Amino acid sequence: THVLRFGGIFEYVESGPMGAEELAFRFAVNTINRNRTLLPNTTLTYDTQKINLYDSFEASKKACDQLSLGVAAIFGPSHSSSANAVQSICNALGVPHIQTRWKHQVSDNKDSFYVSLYPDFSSLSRAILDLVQFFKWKTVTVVYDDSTGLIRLQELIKAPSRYNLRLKIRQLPADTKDAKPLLKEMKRGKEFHVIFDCSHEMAAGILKQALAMGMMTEYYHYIFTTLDLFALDVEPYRYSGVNMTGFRILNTENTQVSSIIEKWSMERLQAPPKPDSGLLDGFMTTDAALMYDAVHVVSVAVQQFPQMTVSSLQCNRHKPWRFGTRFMSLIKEAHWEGLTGRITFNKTNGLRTDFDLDVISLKEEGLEKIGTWDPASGLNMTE
Amino acid sequence: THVLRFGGIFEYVESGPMGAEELAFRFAVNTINRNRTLLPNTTLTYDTQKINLYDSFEASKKACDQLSLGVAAIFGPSHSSSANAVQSICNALGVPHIQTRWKHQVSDNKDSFYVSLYPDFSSLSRAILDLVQFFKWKTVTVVYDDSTGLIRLQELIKAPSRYNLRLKIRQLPADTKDAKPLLKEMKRGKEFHVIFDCSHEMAAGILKQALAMGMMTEYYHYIFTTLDLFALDVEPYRYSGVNMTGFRILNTENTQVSSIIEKWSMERLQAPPKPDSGLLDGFMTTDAALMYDAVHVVSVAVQQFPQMTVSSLQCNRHKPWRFGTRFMSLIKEAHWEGLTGRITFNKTNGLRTDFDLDVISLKEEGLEKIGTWDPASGLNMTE
Amino acid sequence: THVLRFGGIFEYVESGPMGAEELAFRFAVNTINRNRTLLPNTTLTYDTQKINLYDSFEASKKACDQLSLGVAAIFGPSHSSSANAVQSICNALGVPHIQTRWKHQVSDNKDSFYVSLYPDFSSLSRAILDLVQFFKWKTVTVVYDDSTGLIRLQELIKAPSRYNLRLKIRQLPADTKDAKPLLKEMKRGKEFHVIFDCSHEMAAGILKQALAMGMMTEYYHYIFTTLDLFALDVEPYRYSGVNMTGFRILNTENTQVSSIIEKWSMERLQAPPKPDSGLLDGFMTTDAALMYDAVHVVSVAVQQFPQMTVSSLQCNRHKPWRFGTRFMSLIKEAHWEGLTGRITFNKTNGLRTDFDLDVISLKEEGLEKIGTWDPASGLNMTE
Amino acid sequence: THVLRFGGIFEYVESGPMGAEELAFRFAVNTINRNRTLLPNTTLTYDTQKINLYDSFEASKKACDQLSLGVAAIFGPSHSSSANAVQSICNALGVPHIQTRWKHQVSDNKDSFYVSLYPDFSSLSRAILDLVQFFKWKTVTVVYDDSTGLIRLQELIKAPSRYNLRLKIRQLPADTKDAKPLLKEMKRGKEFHVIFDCSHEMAAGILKQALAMGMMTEYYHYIFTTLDLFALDVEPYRYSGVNMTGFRILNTENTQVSSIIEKWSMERLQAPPKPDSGLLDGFMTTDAALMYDAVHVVSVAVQQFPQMTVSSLQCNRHKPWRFGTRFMSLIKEAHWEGLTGRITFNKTNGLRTDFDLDVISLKEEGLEKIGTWDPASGLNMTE
């Protein structure tokens, strides 16, 4: 039988239920257990631990508790300060570390036991930069939220040194949801073409404050850096004449992918969130779409490797895992067509820089696909 | 007697001797032991460990080895990925963590047991931004090296949204010291006013490549973000008619501070570095000036706290240190006039945002102080 | 057999080995002895003497010692005050005097027994004057070193009486290598187009002081009067955007001439000079290229004259040498294609005014031939 | 008694009698022999030899014949190529060498046994350059004759690099007295302020060709570099309204100096020269005034040195003369008020740079003294 024990480190939600990434890790393990074509001989169990996500010492202790109990791969702790502490544990002891969120990989880590299923912002910032040239902009305002967002969109800030733009980089207020003094300066400065680097939970809150201001007109164009633009209640903004361009990697135009998302709204349901937030009700974010994908791409690697045995390692007496070198190379050479499209990894550094996007814009009917991005091709926009 | 045991985590230099920060930690402990006014009853020993500085798992093990052996404060492991792993250990177990280098404090860490003696780049980027307005620039090029340098100078990038500039943000080549294709684009683009965000070991290498190009003339003006501009062999550049503006926090205009630097060249000497690098020979960097200061500011706190006892804590069974709360508040409320001037800490977050700079520029004679920055006052430039 | 005894008077180098002209005289005699097409029946020996070069009385005694011992031609003592003393001895006693350096021939010497293989500055100063008109200059600064340099470039100083220029004649400092107060006046006076009349050992020292000043830019253009511009380490000046125009008579674009220069670096090698001089290592100067040529052009004359016998003459009882009139006319009517190109003499005064130059300028790759001068044609510059 | 034997080397005039310098050497020896205050115990004889003046080998043989016969000082052979051959003989054997003509002393001769009684052109070219500033010229034409005249007036050519002039340097025709095509270009170019660097035998021939042209008017001003401007028949040019400025060192405004010149016209007389030359008849040139002075200044040195004995030296077995060091220092420290004024020598190099001139210009009456030059003072022009 040989039950595998893919471990995971997730957020400790105090009041509410388990998070969307923790549900998607439980849903993807149960899907492979029920289905019989993928892994027809083995079953998957899990060892999910809950941390604060903002404490590298709690993430380091529970990652060593999973390797002492014996796991095969750690599914990342969702945060830059916490994943860097668990990445180096997984490097030292040979166990893979599967990342589904963006993290600043500094250019001096010689770490090899990690892959990142999140679309890398060296590729995404070229997708925005191609998109501002299709629209023939010459005056752009980038509004980010946290200081790490300069590292994300740095290929867009280095654009007036090459192309013909003038970037005016602005930042959202750090403490409050009171971005109206930001939007007053953007209205007085006549900044009609704006790029927002913020999550869809925050991008929904800016659009209410841009509607309370006089900024949702036929003159304003908003490109959103988030991949969850198909999660917003856009009904107050369809008839304004705005354009709200963005991307979508979640391949919701298949009968197989949408069937999983239609099943997703059932088991998640459990008191859906607040009504005064401009998001939808039944929707899978791309944060939980990549955790459903992260279990399956590694499941390609355990399918092509039947001699696998989960060992029990110790952090104090660290030894590399016996099959760690080959099993890491089977993850980096794994191809899969998951919810977010084709999943191929970067052979140099282990990232995900080759992926397919879907350019979506706001029409009178709603968010509609008007193109397709591809790092080999570029914007094939059939608008 | 009560010997204290200030611990430290430093770089493992393989071929050469101990690093400049490790010498400055040994020199500052031996200075307080020899001198009798500061701590007239106690002596200081140390437990210096050597790590890779790019491995958070090695820094986490040796920080727990110091707390198992029993230390009073950890002097930081000199790097963003390594200090974040040791900051959270020192937070969980109550021991202070003394930082002498800049690190991206994310806005969600609820850590309290850390202070940073490095001048914070929220204050330094206002010192550069005041300096480009004294010089009445309207066209600025910021050249950084690593992607974290956008977080450092982010108050300068958000300047064309307020003032009258146009920033053209550029980046040094990531792999090679071959910044001449960068300097060709800056020469063809007619970019005479340049800000360099790079270390003085790299800023010396850019000036050779700006002299090999036709870019050291009476038209080019270079502001350096580094505080070690008074460490460069500037003899090939005095007569060019260039201006090389910068800052200096190392208060080398006192008979007491310069006496320590004159003693510094003796015990450090030990095969001084390569001749094909445009730096000086006998000089203390500001990286080792802040480690000499870091021992003394905490020595103010052990002077005002005689009931101190060093305990032995364990990371697996983590308990806060018995005097950790009061001793951390005595470090944050400690004032000291060290090598880098007056040392007062930020009462909100524990940083160092209130400090005195010395604006230095290049004249025909050499680097000469032409002003003084102060967050309360601003540029008092008697040029 | 009839061994010939071409004599020579050279510099007494005290510390180091024999000079470059004395090596080239030994190398050219040994080449004709080894080769069998030129002089297939006779061999050449030599009687090299060493003087101070600045004492006409020592040069006069050793020239009479060579004629008492019996020579066929004296190869000149490399200096104006010393060669004039030996020219008149060779005139009185019929022996030829072969000159390879420039000397002020006053317009009243009725001397006939001398030829000069150095390119005459009545022709060279027209080559510079054609070159400042191809570049369309209207404001020229001539910087010479010694007062004889006005006689050299006098056809360039008499140019504003004919053409449209304004010469500002300046002089290098007489005692020191401290030409920076000269270069300050040329920088404050905005003198971008400069002609340097100095040797390549001194022209390498001016370019360091023009790089220490802000004067190696894309605005400054330097014409060098020396013919050894292809002997300078030009690597610090390739990327500056400067132009460094000059000439080259040493025909280094043949497989036969460069083969001799490739053999030249072997026997000369013998502790190559100082590293703090901006010259190359393996190179033949045009001062030693003309001494290799001086032996061969006279070897054309002994090939066309087999009845030659070397006699023994006395200066106190001076008698013309028996074959002095015919053998001098065979040297003046000798054609040879040596290292410096075709070697034909002026039939009026015995000089060398008909010769081929190669206009070389500084590109990004290095010194590159961009034309060809010729007294019949002029500048055929395929730049 | 101790008869001294001051030797001399002069011109071999074939057809006519002895030259003006040879008469002045015979006249000055006979004057000191007749007079009894100067040298009241010793008499002077001489050993005058005649050379071609353009042959350094004939000058070298007869200088060794005088030292073999035994002389005390050689009075120079009047020419640059011949005096350099005799200067080095007198240096090697200790005998002084008294020069009365200008010669290019190169900056590398370490010769000590020579003095020059001719007014040095480093001082004279400052006297012309002060004179063109008193007259407030801004456009100057320098017309020289031979290429050595650039070395003479080089402090005047380097003037537009300091002051406000524009020099147009021209040259007289080398072969013919046909300077009218030169004067046509100076008339068409409107060059009214001209400096002539030529002898008074040639300056008289230019003024006929400037009178045959339309160039002797009230618009043309001619400064003459020669010191024999008070030797020209100026009667055709008094009423033209020209100005002909110049200098005079021959102190013809004393009753003692003019008495010697009135005696000079008696013994010289001997078929006075051609009538078609615009010079006077009874006049002493400054070339023969300095040879009368050269015997007397050395006669000061033999008066202050009674233990002198003339020895007999050989050039082939050269030994320094026994009293050569002290007797040379008595010549350089000798003061005399001769025909040309006060005679003091330059203590550094042995030249004559401290002397008194008399600025003379052309009035309606004739050449009239209008000032006085002095290197300490400058132009004290009481015009």
Ligand SMILES: *[C@@H]1O[C@H](CO)[C@@H](O[C@@H]2O[C@H](CO)[C@@H](O[C@@H]3O[C@H](CO)[C@@H](O)[C@H](O)[C@@H]3O)[C@H](O)[C@H]2NC(C)=O)[C@H](O)[C@H]1NC(C)=O
């Ligand atoms: C349970 O079975 C397998 C487990 O490996 C799941 O993967 C699918 O397997 C089938 C055949 O092995 C393939 O189906 C493909 O579906 C896509 C729809 O996106 C279609 O374009 C292809 O032409 C093909 O029909 C495929 O290898 C794989 N599906 C994907 C998306 O990679 C399967 O989805 C599970 N569920 C069911 C209901 O079978």
Ligand SMILES: *[C@@H]1O[C@H](CO)[C@@H](O[C@@H]2O[C@H](CO)[C@@H](O[C@@H]3O[C@H](CO)[C@@H](O)[C@H](O)[C@@H]3O)[C@H](O)[C@H]2NC(C)=O)[C@H](O)[C@H]1NC(C)=O
């Ligand atoms: C594995 O990782 C490396 C490093 O990220 C990938 O190299 C990158 O490949 C792209 C090819 O598109 C390079 O060019 C970039 O293309 C865009 C297209 O518009 C254009 O704006 C520029 O030409 C831009 O440079 C990119 O420079 C290069 N990155 C580096 C650091 O060299 C590589 O493709 C990955 N391997 C895969 C996906 O198989």
Ligand SMILES: *[C@@H]1O[C@H](CO)[C@@H](O[C@@H]2O[C@H](CO)[C@@H](O[C@@H]3O[C@H](CO)[C@@H](O)[C@H](O)[C@@H]3O)[C@H](O)[C@H]2NC(C)=O)[C@H](O)[C@H]1NC(C)=O
């Ligand atoms: C403790 O830390 C806080 C934040 O780290 C410090 O507050 C900061 O104070 C500076 C200067 O007052 C503010 O910067 C800017 O000042 C200039 C000129 O006054 C102007 O361009 C802006 O209006 C801005 O105020 C900075 O924004 C502010 N930070 C925050 C978050 O409010 C505080 O001063 C520190 N306390 C000390 C050193 O005692």
Ligand SMILES: *[C@@H]1O[C@H](CO)[C@@H](O[C@@H]2O[C@H](CO)[C@@H](O[C@@H]3O[C@H](CO)[C@@H](O)[C@H](O)[C@@H]3O)[C@H](O)[C@H]2NC(C)=O)[C@H](O)[C@H]1NC(C)=O
């Ligand atoms: C032998 O020597 C004499 C003089 O040393 C040479 O005569 C010289 O020839 C050159 C060129 O023909 C004359 O230079 C100048 O030429 C240019 C352009 O043609 C122009 O700017 C002037 O009009 C001038 O002619 C130079 O003046 C002339 N020298 C004399 C004194 O007449 C002669 O060419 C030599 N013979 C050979 C090399 O066979």
Ligand SMILES: *[C@@H]1O[C@H](CO)[C@@H](O[C@@H]2O[C@H](CO)[C@@H](O[C@@H]3O[C@H](CO)[C@@H](O)[C@H](O)[C@@H]3O)[C@H](O)[C@H]2NC(C)=O)[C@H](O)[C@H]1NC(C)=O
């Ligand atoms: C013969 O005697 C001496 C030989 O040494 C000649 O030199 C003159 O000697 C006298 C008295 O020793 C001085 O005369 C001076 O004359 C100048 C006129 O230029 C006058 O300004 C003075 O006030 C003084 O009277 C003087 O030392 C010297 N003369 C000069 C010009 O230096 C003397 O000239 C010979 N001839 C006669 C006729 O005495």
Ligand SMILES: *[C@@H]1O[C@H](CO)[C@@H](O[C@@H]2O[C@H](CO)[C@@H](O[C@@H]3O[C@H](CO)[C@@H](O)[C@H](O)[C@@H]3O)[C@H](O)[C@H]2NC(C)=O)[C@H](O)[C@H]1NC(C)=O
């Ligand atoms: C011995 O020889 C030296 C070298 O020739 C003499 O030094 C020269 O002295 C003059 C003083 O007048 C220096 O200044 C020159 O003065 C004129 C006056 O108008 C002015 O145009 C400049 O200031 C000019 O430089 C001159 O530079 C200096 N020569 C050198 C090469 O330094 C010295 O005076 C002689 N000793 C005597 C006469 O006792």
Ligand SMILES: *[C@@H]1O[C@H](CO)[C@@H](O[C@@H]2O[C@H](CO)[C@@H](O)[C@H](O)[C@H]2NC(C)=O)[C@H](O)[C@H]1NC(C)=O
């Ligand atoms: C020893 O330590 C004491 C610490 O107080 C030093 O004394 C201080 O010296 C500075 C200038 O040297 C003064 O500004 C302070 O006021 C002094 N403090 C006190 C309390 O007097 C002393 O300089 C140190 N000596 C050595 C040799 O290191």
Ligand SMILES: *[C@@H]1O[C@H](CO)[C@@H](O[C@@H]2O[C@H](CO)[C@@H](O)[C@H](O)[C@H]2NC(C)=O)[C@H](O)[C@H]1NC(C)=O
């Ligand atoms: C030996 O001397 C002869 C001299 O004639 C050289 O032969 C000449 O070589 C050059 C090129 O090498 C040709 O352009 C000439 O036409 C040749 N002349 C003749 C008559 O053949 C020969 O190269 C010399 N060889 C060596 C090794 O020095």
Ligand SMILES: *[C@@H]1O[C@H](CO)[C@@H](O)[C@H](O)[C@H]1NC(C)=O
């Ligand atoms: C909306 O999109 C269309 C198509 O690109 C464009 O013509 C229009 O200007 C856009 N509206 C804006 C930018 O407000």
Ligand SMILES: *[C@@H]1O[C@H](CO)[C@@H](O)[C@H](O)[C@H]1NC(C)=O
């Ligand atoms: C671009 O899109 C068109 C139609 O949407 C289709 O031919 C194909 O998807 C793309 N063509 C390419 C990539 O050549």
Ligand SMILES: *[C@@H]1O[C@H](CO)[C@@H](O)[C@H](O)[C@H]1NC(C)=O
């Ligand atoms: C540079 O500094 C100099 C002083 O050395 C000053 O005169 C000048 O204004 C500054 N700026 C420029 C652009 O030269």
Ligand SMILES: *[C@@H]1O[C@H](CO)[C@@H](O)[C@H](O)[C@H]1NC(C)=O
């Ligand atoms: C800076 O301030 C100090 C005291 O506050 C003063 O002594 C100095 O002159 C000031 N600098 C100026 C005015 O340039």
Ligand SMILES: *[C@@H]1O[C@H](CO)[C@@H](O)[C@H](O)[C@H]1NC(C)=O
């Ligand atoms: C210098 O040479 C370059 C070629 O390298 C040419 O383009 C330019 O016109 C020349 N002159 C100047 C003043 O740069």
Ligand SMILES: *[C@@H]1O[C@H](CO)[C@@H](O)[C@H](O)[C@H]1NC(C)=O
């Ligand atoms: C110079 O002339 C030669 C032949 O006379 C010719 O090959 C060359 O092309 C010419 N240079 C030019 C035209 O720039």
Ligand SMILES: *[C@@H]1O[C@H](CO)[C@@H](O)[C@H](O)[C@H]1NC(C)=O
């Ligand atoms: C002659 O001299 C006087 C006095 O300097 C002057 O005014 C006049 O112009 C001169 N004549 C010329 C220069 O032709």
Ligand SMILES: *[C@@H]1O[C@H](CO)[C@@H](O)[C@H](O)[C@H]1NC(C)=O
């Ligand atoms: C200048 O000349 C005046 C009168 O000609 C006279 O005082 C003296 O000769 C000179 N004065 C000086 C040099 O002070």
